[PDB]
Amino acid sequence: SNSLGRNCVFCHNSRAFYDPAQHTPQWATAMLGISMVQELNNEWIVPIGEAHLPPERLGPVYNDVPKLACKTCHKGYQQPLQGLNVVADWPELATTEGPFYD
Amino acid sequence: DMTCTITCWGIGVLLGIMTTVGLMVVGWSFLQGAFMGVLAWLIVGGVLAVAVCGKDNAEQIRAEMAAARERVRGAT
Amino acid sequence: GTGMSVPEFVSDLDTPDPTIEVFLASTSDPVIPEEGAQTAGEAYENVDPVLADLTVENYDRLLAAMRSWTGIPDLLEDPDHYQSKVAINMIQMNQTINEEWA
Amino acid sequence: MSKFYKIWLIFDPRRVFVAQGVFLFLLAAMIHLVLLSTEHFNWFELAAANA
Amino acid sequence: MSKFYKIWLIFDPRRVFVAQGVFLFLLAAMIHLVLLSTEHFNWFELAAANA
Amino acid sequence: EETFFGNFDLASLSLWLFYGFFALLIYYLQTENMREGYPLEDEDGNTAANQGPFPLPKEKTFKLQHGRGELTLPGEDVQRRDNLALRKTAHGNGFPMEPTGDPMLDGVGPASWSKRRDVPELDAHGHPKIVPMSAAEGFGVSAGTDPRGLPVMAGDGEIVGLVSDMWIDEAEQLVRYLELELDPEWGDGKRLVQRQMVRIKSDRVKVRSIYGKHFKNVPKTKSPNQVTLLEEDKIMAYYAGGTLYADESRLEPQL
Amino acid sequence: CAIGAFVSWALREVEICRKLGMGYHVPFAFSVAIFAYVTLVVFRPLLMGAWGHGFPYGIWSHLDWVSNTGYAYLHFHYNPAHMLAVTFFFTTTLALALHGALVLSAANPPKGEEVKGPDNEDTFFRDFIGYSIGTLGIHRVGLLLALNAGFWSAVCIIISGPVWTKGWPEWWNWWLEMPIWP
Amino acid sequence: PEYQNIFTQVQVQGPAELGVDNENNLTEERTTGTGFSQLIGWIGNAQLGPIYLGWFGIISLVTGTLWFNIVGFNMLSQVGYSIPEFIRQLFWLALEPPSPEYGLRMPPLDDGGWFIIASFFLLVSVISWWLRTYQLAEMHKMGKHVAWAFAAAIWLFLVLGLFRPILMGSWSEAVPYGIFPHLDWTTAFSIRYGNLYYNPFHALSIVFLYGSVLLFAMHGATILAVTRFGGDRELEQIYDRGTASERAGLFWRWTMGFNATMEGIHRWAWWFAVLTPITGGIGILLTGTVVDNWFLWAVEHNFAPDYTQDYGYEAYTTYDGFLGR
Ligand code: BCL
Ligand code: BCL
Ligand code: BCL
Ligand SMILES: CC[C@H]1c2cc3[nH]c4c(c3C)C(=O)[C@H](C(=O)OC)c4c3nc(cc4[nH]c(cc(n2)[C@@H]1C)c(C(C)=O)c4C)[C@@H](C)[C@@H]3CCC(=O)OC/C=C(\C)CCC[C@H](C)CCC[C@H](C)CCCC(C)C
Ligand SMILES: CC[C@H]1c2cc3[nH]c4c(c3C)C(=O)[C@H](C(=O)OC)c4c3nc(cc4[nH]c(cc(n2)[C@@H]1C)c(C(C)=O)c4C)[C@@H](C)[C@@H]3CCC(=O)OC/C=C(\C)CCC[C@H](C)CCC[C@H](C)CCCC(C)C
Ligand SMILES: CC[C@H]1c2cc3[nH]c4c(c3C)C(=O)[C@H](C(=O)OC)c4c3nc(cc4[nH]c(cc(n2)[C@@H]1C)c(C(C)=O)c4C)[C@@H](C)[C@@H]3CCC(=O)OC/C=C(\C)CCC[C@H](C)CCC[C@H](C)CCCC(C)C
Ligand SMILES: COC1=C(OC)C(=O)C(C/C=C(\C)CC/C=C(\C)CC/C=C(\C)CC/C=C(\C)CC/C=C(\C)CC/C=C(\C)CC/C=C(/C)CC/C=C(\C)CC/C=C(\C)CCC=C(C)C)=C(C)C1=O
Ligand code: HEM
Ligand SMILES: COC(C)(C)C(=O)C/C=C(\C)CC/C=C(\C)CC/C=C(\C)CCCC/C(C)=C\CCC(C)CC/C=C(\C)CCC=C(C)C
Ligand SMILES: [Fe+3]
């Protein structure tokens, strides 16, 4: 809630926190975001930094590597940059294959 | 002599407000200044009410009243 | 009647994200590839992810976008520096995010 | 300044003594703590730094 | 300085003694705890680090 | 966990048991509160045909202190008034009553009093509970404004006399009554005022309930050193009756 | 209709008090409950800008509204006025229990024993806890406690929507970030 | 306006009252020494003390002090013995119950031993106080209504701390000793087992709490209204009925069609207050042991409301429309 700037009744009905028939469509987006965050942390962000980052960027205890979460992108807003289209001008960062300028 | 006590309480409230505004001036926030202002109210108001209003009016009654307790003590 | 709502101050709804205007001042339109355009691999010595791009595309993505969005003024100049190796992986991570997590 | 002794003809010595005893200790404690809240005058940390 | 014995003619020694004892014990406990709160003078941890 | 039948489980059994217990408790509580004022009567003083769905409770006995006997309830009404100067304004039930003479002097309406015992209330030692301040040893004013010596102003702005004494409650250290010495113009003797109906100021004491002319007819105490329950009731209610009967405008609609 | 009925009930109580020649404390006490209800259904929706912020008229559907409104601020237990109101409620219940028990025990001694008086109750509570409030101060205390509970409930509900917007736990950052702390 | 009898106009002070006595010799254990407070004399009595010092009281005081000191020193040690940090985080610290993995066995000192020791001390202290309140009433020749009303709350105390953890077979089901942690426990307990609103006994306890608060407001207002007729001396009114009781009864009879007596209203008050912790403990004891989801229980028992409209903000407005773009 503090990451999106919303509250519990956003995505939930508090009289039944478990019932799938009393959720909103944003619940599914959050459920997808959980898996996306897990994959990003366990596949890309952590394997790198463990081999290149200097010691000065490792945290107070455990000497970890910095990780990302919801607020790394949302930063206290419902949508990052309040829904700005940041990919229409950069086809090179949209597809792993050859860029499609069509 | 409840009027003097109420006057002391009002002085404490005014001092708390003044200290709160001064704390805004220094660079604190509203609640941070308000807490210290309330502290000042209660402490200074209580101290003034106990001390200043504890000087009940008397010119020669006080001395004999003080002297009377100097006689009860010393033989008890 | 269920009490399901999200309150917000009117004076806070009118204040946009203070970083939206920064992005719009550091973006540019793409350049449509021509017939037989010279790629960035035939003009410098670079990494394979960024080797098939054109010269103008490499220009307006390398300096105009990446060296300002991350505030590293000399990104991707010395190939042995750790920041370049991190950025090369971050490009692919961004591509995967945009493709496989639509 | 030779007639300062008349203050004991007005103020109760016991109440004034109690008030002064509280106030002096309170002021000393606050002064010591204020000296402890800085970096240049913190002997506890200075001993560890010089060890 | 030679007439300091007159203080007992003003204050009852019972309350003074009780207050002195309580104040001394509380101050000693506070000072020992403050010494415990640091790293340089924490004698238990120093003994643990020397074994 | 399982069910006995259908959806019935331990929680339902507990709920139904609580329902039964609550019904019985409500019956007991309502029946316990019918020890005064029953059986009901009509407006002619006869027993009414309807008495309600709750029957009368059984008897209980109170053993009183200082050898004053015993009290058994429910029973006969010993505080009943004998001859009331009242008149019916209708032939049936449900309509008000009309005073026959002077309501303040006849003790009807908001000036009504109950026929209590004609003996003073006693403390733990067996002494009268309320005593004048001139006979209580070691009592003195510790806070507030001392009302003794101040003039008394009535409800219409008339000064009737000075406050001469206070009657205090020794057991609870509380002031109960203020004694008043009347000017010869406004009457003779002394009268008592309950502390709950006065407003002490720095220079005067004001009684807004009654006017100046109503001060000579305040009931007097038989003894100068004590007061009984019956006298307190009559004095206290006389003072309460003035909120309605001291003027014609206090009785008519305010609008 | 409900607002009209409540006001008429209060004024009828006023008329009965005037006829019986007693004080007007009961209508004044009822006015606080009327104030709390009006704050719930009138003042807060008026400040928030819609009549849809009032609770529904259902036996079991007016609790879902309470739940959803409480969870709209993340943790409603961290509201200080809610703390004050809950404390007042608990204190009022305890005081009522003690007063009833003391009066009943004084009026109902063991079988074969005489009844008691105010002196006995005063001794009991001074022996019990070291202080007695008296037969007159207890009623003042109870009335004040109930009125304070109602008033602080109204304040707690009215500050939640139009004055504070974020979560309630975050409100304590003024204490957690005071300059005096090292 | 008329005097409202909320603050006393003038105070009087006399010799201090030491208390009544009988052949039980209550004087031998009472202290000597009293004080007077003029600030409190504006509302109630001014005399302070004396107090009765038995053995139950001393035992309870010492053992409760031990519990307090244990909790406080554990909280202090958890922060590094830093007094400024102890003051800063006072409302956030606690003494946590043991871990779920230890069942009903005795856990280590790091994971719940001190919690068990402090809980044992607190139990002993509470039982000692109850025994003292019974003994005092037994020696003054009075009824034991105070002891029963305390036992009413001790029942809920024990259910929340002792009986339910044993029934559930774990010491981890107790409540932590902290200001904010205990509220967190309340909310987490409500969420974990469905919705506590749909527990009927929680509703009954809420009903009785509301009724008790309403009843004290009504009774205080009524007694202050008829105080001009000596209405605060309730016992003498019970023994010898006066006009104050008649007027107080007639007010409520004309208002709502039925009334009470001077002695019967206190029975109403006693029961409404006592019935709250009893129903609360009965409702709490059934959670988890019998019912694991209260919303599903309500649905199966057909008193859960149904809604027709849709969910989501996009069914009512637009994101751009909300921002005003
Ligand atoms: C997720 C839920 C949140 C929460 C969310 C809220 C919200 C939201 C509210 C409070 C409110 C309250 N909370 Mg909280 N609260 C929570 C849990 C708790 C807990 C606890 C966990 O122990 C406690 C003790 C309380 C207690 C309280 C009280 C302080 C307060 C209740 C108002 C009141 O009594 O006004 C009593 C006043 C009235 C409204 C009475 C009105 C009576 C009228 C005038 C007369 C009725 C006439 C009738 C129709 C006659 C017909 C009958 C005839 C005989 C036929 N909360 C949790 C943490 N709380 C409420 C509040 O403060 O409201 C102002 C509120 O709305
Ligand atoms: C690393 C060691 C810690 C320390 C650890 C402790 C511990 C632990 C304790 C104290 C205690 C005391 N310490 Mg030391 N103490 C330290 C250094 C100092 C210094 C200093 C400026 O250097 C002073 C003035 C003090 C002050 C004091 C006294 C207030 C007190 C014992 C005497 C007393 O109660 O009678 C006060 C004085 C008199 C009335 C006597 C009159 C004249 C006498 C001869 C003065 C000597 C007192 C003092 C101990 C001498 C230190 C002088 C040097 C500057 C060190 N300490 C350092 C910082 N100290 C003990 C105590 O009782 O605390 C409550 C105690 O338990
Ligand atoms: C998110 C929160 C959940 C919720 C979770 C709970 C839980 C969990 C519980 C309560 C409980 C209660 N709830 Mg609920 N409750 C909610 C919402 C509400 C709302 C509302 C929204 O308005 C209300 C009105 C209430 C109010 C209530 C009370 C009716 C009831 C407390 C019983 C009692 O007597 O407590 C008074 C407290 C006591 C009597 C405790 C015992 C006291 C003992 C005797 C203390 C001994 C003294 C001590 C050791 C010494 C101290 C030191 C001294 C200074 C010397 N709930 C929501 C839905 N509710 C309790 C209950 O019974 O529910 C069934 C309970 O456990
Ligand atoms: C702090 C103040 C406390 C208090 C005080 C209080 N209440 C009072 C009084 C006092 C001093 C009275 O003198 C008066 C009385 O006569 O009591 C016997 C009363 C009273 N308070 C009552 C109840 C009550 N008090 C409550 C609360 C409180 N009472 C507070 C805790 C509560 C709750 C929810 O806690 C309730 C339910 C009434 C029984 C009674 C007077 C109500 C009355 O009869 O009003 C006249 C109206 C009708 C006869 C019916 C009107 C019907 C409506 C027109 C339609 C329905 C509208 C309503 C919004 C529906 C709600 C449905 C719900 C399921 C949501
Ligand atoms: C909510 C009820 C709880 C409670 C309440 C309570 N106890 C009280 C009081 C109250 C309201 C007092 O007023 C009275 C007291 O003296 O308070 C300062 C007291 C008291 N209960 C005490 C103890 C006590 N009560 C206990 C029980 C409880 N205290 C209940 C659980 C316990 C427990 C739980 O074990 C203990 C240990 C004593 C400290 C004290 C009994 C008074 C006595 O024996 O002598 C006091 C008299 C004097 C010698 C002088 C007055 C004391 C002043 C502090 C000094 C001078 C002040 C001046 C005279 C006026 C005071 C100003 C006011 C603002 C107080
Ligand atoms: C009918 C149910 C209601 C109820 C009733 C009730 N409570 C009761 C009683 C009754 C009938 C008592 O007879 C008993 C009592 O003594 O009342 C005065 C009590 C009591 N209910 C209490 C608390 C309480 N009641 C609560 C609620 C309720 N109790 C219900 C609403 C609640 C809550 C959560 O709502 C609490 C917190 C206590 C005040 C008291 C029980 C006293 C007790 O058990 O003491 C044991 C002793 C100790 C733990 C030692 C403590 C040592 C301290 C560290 C210092 C000494 C005490 C000191 C006075 C405090 C600090 C003073 C400072 C100046 C230093
Ligand atoms: C020490 O001191 C004290 C006392 O004393 C000794 C006391 O006692 C009390 C009181 C305390 C108690 C009794 C304890 C119990 C109390 C409670 C548990 C509190 C909770 C109470 C309730 C739940 C019950 C309250 C009930 C109410 C409010 C409803 C009752 C009201 C009505 C039925 C309607 C009111 C009637 C009116 C307005 C008059 C009719 C109107 C007219 C215009 C008349 C014209 C004629 C007609 C319309 C046709 C005929 C009308 C009829 C028959 C009316 C019925 C109509 C119906 C439709 C049914 C206290 C506090 C006290 O401290
Ligand atoms: C657990 C993880 C996350 C949660 C709970 C979350 C929450 C949400 C929700 C609910 C929405 C839809 C909002 C709406 O419908 O208005 C959303 C969309 C979005 N989120 Fe997040 N998010 C998470 C993490 C992230 C991260 C880490 C990224 C990017 C890498 C991200 C970027 C976005 C974007 C770009 C949108 C806008 C989609 C659109 O509506 O067009 N989110 N998020
Ligand atoms: C160190 O500094 C000093 C000296 C100043 C101090 O001492 C400081 C002290 C503090 C700052 C202390 C602060 C204390 C708190 C904030 C305490 C808070 C306490 C609670 C909220 C306690 C709640 C307790 C209980 C609850 C909610 C319910 C039920 C409990 C019980 C029934 C407990 C009884 C336990 C039993 C029966 C189990 C015993 C186990 C056996 C095996 C017999
Ligand atoms: Fe009462």
mmCIF file of C-alpha atoms in Angstrom, chain F residues 50-215:
data_model
loop_
_atom_site.group_PDB
_atom_site.id
_atom_site.type_symbol
_atom_site.label_atom_id
_atom_site.label_comp_id
_atom_site.label_asym_id
_atom_site.label_seq_id
_atom_site.Cartn_x
_atom_site.Cartn_y
_atom_site.Cartn_z
ATOM 1 C CA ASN F 50 -55.258 -4.380 34.342
ATOM 2 C CA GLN F 51 -52.113 -5.242 36.305
ATOM 3 C CA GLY F 52 -49.631 -6.244 33.591
ATOM 4 C CA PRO F 53 -47.979 -9.506 32.535
ATOM 5 C CA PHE F 54 -45.443 -9.684 35.394
ATOM 6 C CA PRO F 55 -46.819 -11.003 38.708
ATOM 7 C CA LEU F 56 -45.718 -9.476 41.986
ATOM 8 C CA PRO F 57 -42.502 -10.787 43.582
ATOM 9 C CA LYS F 58 -42.135 -12.471 46.957
ATOM 10 C CA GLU F 59 -41.239 -10.794 50.237
ATOM 11 C CA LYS F 60 -37.813 -9.816 51.558
ATOM 12 C CA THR F 61 -36.829 -8.435 54.962
ATOM 13 C CA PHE F 62 -34.382 -5.647 55.828
ATOM 14 C CA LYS F 63 -32.838 -5.474 59.306
ATOM 15 C CA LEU F 64 -32.164 -1.815 60.094
ATOM 16 C CA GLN F 65 -29.510 -0.348 62.380
ATOM 17 C CA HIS F 66 -29.921 1.554 65.663
ATOM 18 C CA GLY F 67 -32.877 -0.626 66.668
ATOM 19 C CA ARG F 68 -35.367 0.909 64.244
ATOM 20 C CA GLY F 69 -37.027 -2.426 63.495
ATOM 21 C CA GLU F 70 -37.459 -4.289 60.212
ATOM 22 C CA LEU F 71 -38.814 -3.483 56.756
ATOM 23 C CA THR F 72 -40.608 -6.029 54.562
ATOM 24 C CA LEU F 73 -41.242 -5.451 50.855
ATOM 25 C CA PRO F 74 -43.445 -5.522 48.876
ATOM 26 C CA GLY F 75 -46.053 -4.270 51.336
ATOM 27 C CA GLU F 76 -48.374 -1.437 52.236
ATOM 28 C CA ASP F 77 -47.516 2.166 51.365
ATOM 29 C CA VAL F 78 -46.496 3.928 54.588
ATOM 30 C CA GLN F 79 -45.405 7.116 52.765
ATOM 31 C CA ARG F 80 -48.835 7.791 51.345
ATOM 32 C CA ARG F 81 -50.371 11.237 51.652
ATOM 33 C CA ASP F 82 -53.813 11.464 53.234
ATOM 34 C CA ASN F 83 -55.804 14.456 51.919
ATOM 35 C CA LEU F 84 -54.603 16.045 48.671
ATOM 36 C CA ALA F 85 -56.149 19.293 47.406
ATOM 37 C CA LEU F 86 -56.513 18.196 43.790
ATOM 38 C CA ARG F 87 -59.370 18.214 41.287
ATOM 39 C CA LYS F 88 -59.993 16.098 38.201
ATOM 40 C CA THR F 89 -60.296 17.952 34.891
ATOM 41 C CA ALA F 90 -62.076 15.060 33.142
ATOM 42 C CA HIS F 91 -64.474 12.211 33.847
ATOM 43 C CA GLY F 92 -62.109 9.471 32.647
ATOM 44 C CA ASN F 93 -58.445 8.579 32.985
ATOM 45 C CA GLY F 94 -55.450 10.169 31.305
ATOM 46 C CA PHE F 95 -55.977 13.879 32.031
ATOM 47 C CA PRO F 96 -54.153 16.231 34.430
ATOM 48 C CA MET F 97 -55.172 17.470 37.883
ATOM 49 C CA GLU F 98 -56.011 20.989 39.026
ATOM 50 C CA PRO F 99 -54.806 22.432 42.357
ATOM 51 C CA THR F 100 -57.593 23.518 44.698
ATOM 52 C CA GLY F 101 -55.756 26.047 46.873
ATOM 53 C CA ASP F 102 -52.150 27.243 46.950
ATOM 54 C CA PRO F 103 -49.946 24.544 45.353
ATOM 55 C CA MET F 104 -46.810 25.797 47.119
ATOM 56 C CA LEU F 105 -48.589 25.759 50.493
ATOM 57 C CA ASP F 106 -50.550 22.549 49.798
ATOM 58 C CA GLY F 107 -47.562 20.453 48.685
ATOM 59 C CA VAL F 108 -48.886 19.331 45.296
ATOM 60 C CA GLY F 109 -47.227 19.155 41.903
ATOM 61 C CA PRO F 110 -43.506 19.961 41.803
ATOM 62 C CA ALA F 111 -43.910 21.023 45.461
ATOM 63 C CA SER F 112 -45.003 17.550 46.603
ATOM 64 C CA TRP F 113 -43.288 15.890 49.558
ATOM 65 C CA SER F 114 -43.317 12.315 50.829
ATOM 66 C CA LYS F 115 -44.366 11.266 54.318
ATOM 67 C CA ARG F 116 -41.044 10.076 55.641
ATOM 68 C CA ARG F 117 -40.180 9.264 59.248
ATOM 69 C CA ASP F 118 -40.120 12.153 61.722
ATOM 70 C CA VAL F 119 -36.636 11.299 63.011
ATOM 71 C CA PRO F 120 -33.189 12.561 62.040
ATOM 72 C CA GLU F 121 -30.783 10.485 59.987
ATOM 73 C CA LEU F 122 -27.966 8.999 62.055
ATOM 74 C CA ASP F 123 -24.308 8.320 61.313
ATOM 75 C CA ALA F 124 -22.287 5.284 62.424
ATOM 76 C CA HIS F 125 -21.953 6.567 66.007
ATOM 77 C CA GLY F 126 -25.685 7.227 66.398
ATOM 78 C CA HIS F 127 -25.456 11.034 66.252
ATOM 79 C CA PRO F 128 -27.555 13.224 63.943
ATOM 80 C CA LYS F 129 -25.895 13.299 60.541
ATOM 81 C CA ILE F 130 -26.378 17.001 59.710
ATOM 82 C CA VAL F 131 -25.140 19.444 62.358
ATOM 83 C CA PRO F 132 -24.696 23.250 62.363
ATOM 84 C CA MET F 133 -21.124 24.419 61.856
ATOM 85 C CA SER F 134 -21.137 26.231 65.215
ATOM 86 C CA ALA F 135 -21.463 22.887 67.049
ATOM 87 C CA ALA F 136 -18.906 20.885 65.017
ATOM 88 C CA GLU F 137 -15.462 20.949 66.632
ATOM 89 C CA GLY F 138 -12.447 21.246 64.345
ATOM 90 C CA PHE F 139 -14.263 22.170 61.121
ATOM 91 C CA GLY F 140 -13.397 25.171 58.975
ATOM 92 C CA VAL F 141 -13.481 26.537 55.452
ATOM 93 C CA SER F 142 -10.537 25.356 53.346
ATOM 94 C CA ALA F 143 -11.390 26.545 49.815
ATOM 95 C CA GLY F 144 -13.830 28.683 47.880
ATOM 96 C CA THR F 145 -15.713 31.740 49.072
ATOM 97 C CA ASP F 146 -17.080 31.868 52.610
ATOM 98 C CA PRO F 147 -20.812 32.711 52.351
ATOM 99 C CA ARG F 148 -21.275 33.628 56.024
ATOM 100 C CA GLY F 149 -22.105 37.307 56.484
ATOM 101 C CA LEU F 150 -23.100 37.895 52.854
ATOM 102 C CA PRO F 151 -26.543 39.231 51.886
ATOM 103 C CA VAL F 152 -29.084 36.976 50.183
ATOM 104 C CA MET F 153 -30.842 38.072 46.987
ATOM 105 C CA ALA F 154 -34.141 36.484 45.963
ATOM 106 C CA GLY F 155 -35.343 35.573 42.472
ATOM 107 C CA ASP F 156 -36.709 39.070 41.800
ATOM 108 C CA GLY F 157 -33.741 41.088 43.070
ATOM 109 C CA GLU F 158 -34.822 41.612 46.692
ATOM 110 C CA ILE F 159 -32.393 41.346 49.609
ATOM 111 C CA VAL F 160 -34.017 39.385 52.434
ATOM 112 C CA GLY F 161 -31.192 38.928 54.951
ATOM 113 C CA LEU F 162 -27.714 37.596 55.653
ATOM 114 C CA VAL F 163 -26.169 34.136 55.740
ATOM 115 C CA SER F 164 -25.506 33.362 59.405
ATOM 116 C CA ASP F 165 -24.427 29.706 59.514
ATOM 117 C CA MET F 166 -23.820 26.530 57.531
ATOM 118 C CA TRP F 167 -25.076 23.025 58.294
ATOM 119 C CA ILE F 168 -22.463 20.419 57.399
ATOM 120 C CA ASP F 169 -22.285 16.641 57.031
ATOM 121 C CA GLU F 170 -19.641 15.598 59.551
ATOM 122 C CA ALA F 171 -19.288 12.012 58.309
ATOM 123 C CA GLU F 172 -18.635 13.011 54.682
ATOM 124 C CA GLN F 173 -17.185 16.528 55.230
ATOM 125 C CA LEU F 174 -19.700 18.183 52.907
ATOM 126 C CA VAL F 175 -21.908 21.249 53.315
ATOM 127 C CA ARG F 176 -25.636 20.488 53.092
ATOM 128 C CA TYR F 177 -27.599 23.594 54.121
ATOM 129 C CA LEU F 178 -27.185 27.358 54.392
ATOM 130 C CA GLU F 179 -29.005 29.143 57.208
ATOM 131 C CA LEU F 180 -30.648 32.516 56.588
ATOM 132 C CA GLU F 181 -31.673 35.235 59.042
ATOM 133 C CA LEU F 182 -34.618 37.212 57.683
ATOM 134 C CA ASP F 183 -35.117 40.955 57.916
ATOM 135 C CA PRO F 184 -38.211 42.031 59.894
ATOM 136 C CA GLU F 185 -39.777 43.350 56.680
ATOM 137 C CA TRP F 186 -39.566 39.954 54.957
ATOM 138 C CA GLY F 187 -40.467 37.763 57.941
ATOM 139 C CA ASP F 188 -39.196 36.517 61.283
ATOM 140 C CA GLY F 189 -36.904 33.743 62.452
ATOM 141 C CA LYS F 190 -34.464 31.716 60.390
ATOM 142 C CA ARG F 191 -34.832 29.509 57.315
ATOM 143 C CA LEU F 192 -32.732 26.810 55.654
ATOM 144 C CA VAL F 193 -31.702 26.563 51.990
ATOM 145 C CA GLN F 194 -30.218 23.443 50.426
ATOM 146 C CA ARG F 195 -26.752 23.910 48.939
ATOM 147 C CA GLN F 196 -27.849 22.630 45.512
ATOM 148 C CA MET F 197 -30.140 25.632 44.861
ATOM 149 C CA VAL F 198 -27.774 28.544 45.616
ATOM 150 C CA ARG F 199 -25.042 30.417 43.736
ATOM 151 C CA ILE F 200 -22.348 31.950 45.949
ATOM 152 C CA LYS F 201 -20.669 35.051 44.520
ATOM 153 C CA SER F 202 -17.984 37.327 45.928
ATOM 154 C CA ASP F 203 -20.501 39.792 47.403
ATOM 155 C CA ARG F 204 -23.836 37.975 47.436
ATOM 156 C CA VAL F 205 -25.742 34.714 47.445
ATOM 157 C CA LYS F 206 -28.586 34.373 44.939
ATOM 158 C CA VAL F 207 -31.618 32.067 45.082
ATOM 159 C CA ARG F 208 -33.469 32.154 41.756
ATOM 160 C CA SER F 209 -36.164 29.566 42.526
ATOM 161 C CA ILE F 210 -38.512 31.711 44.641
ATOM 162 C CA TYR F 211 -39.215 35.415 45.045
ATOM 163 C CA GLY F 212 -38.934 37.692 48.064
ATOM 164 C CA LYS F 213 -42.537 37.293 49.218
ATOM 165 C CA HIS F 214 -42.251 33.480 49.354
ATOM 166 C CA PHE F 215 -39.554 33.452 52.053
#
